[PDB]
Nucleic acid binder design. Structure first.
Ligand code: K
Ligand code: K
Ligand code: K
Ligand code: MG
Ligand code: MG
Length: 136
RNA sequence: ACAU
DNA sequence: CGATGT
């Protein structure tokens, strides 16, 4: 089982969990940063991993790219497959922004199609995903 | 247990 | 050491 180098890798970064959430997508081969989301003041790790995949799908579709996406998040891969982010984060005024983005990402999934394979990055075999923030 |  | 998730 080998890395598919012609791919997009995504990952969340956070300050606290729940805490400040950001995410980015990179070229798996070169590490070039292709997109980065502006920090969101409160969210969870899994909400951010979910948003990163959905943004990757939107990014690749806009560019007519058939590359797969790698994520290290078992949870977020499932949530994208299900088109449903099963987060436990409370809804209040401080979490309104992240929940709006997650709701809108689900809505996009329910109104668009894609063939993009969403693949598990095998951290145990390959080390940290290329989009990692280097914070652990 | 597994993945973050 | 704590949290988010299956
Ligand atoms: K990891
Ligand atoms: K990190
Ligand atoms: K646990
Ligand atoms: Mg990750
Ligand atoms: Mg990471």
């Amino acid at each position: 089982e080998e890395i598919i180098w012609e791919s997009l890798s995504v990952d969340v970064g956070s300050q606290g969990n729940p805490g400040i959430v950001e995410y980015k997508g990179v070229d798996t081969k070169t590490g070039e940063v292709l997109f980065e989301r502006e920090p969101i003041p409160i969210g969870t790790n899994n909400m951010g991993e979910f948003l990163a995949i959905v943004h990757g799908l939107r990014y690749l579709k806009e560019r007519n790219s058939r590359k797969p996406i790698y994520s290290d998040s078992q949870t977020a891969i499932k949530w994208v497959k299900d088109k449903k982010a099963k987060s436990t984060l409370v809804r209040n005024e401080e979490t309104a922004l992240i929940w709006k983005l997650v709701d809108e990402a689900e809505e996009w999934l329910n109104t668009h199609t894609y063939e993009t394979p969403i693949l598990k990055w095998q951290t145990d075999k390959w080390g940290e995903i290329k989009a990692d923030y280097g914070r652990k």
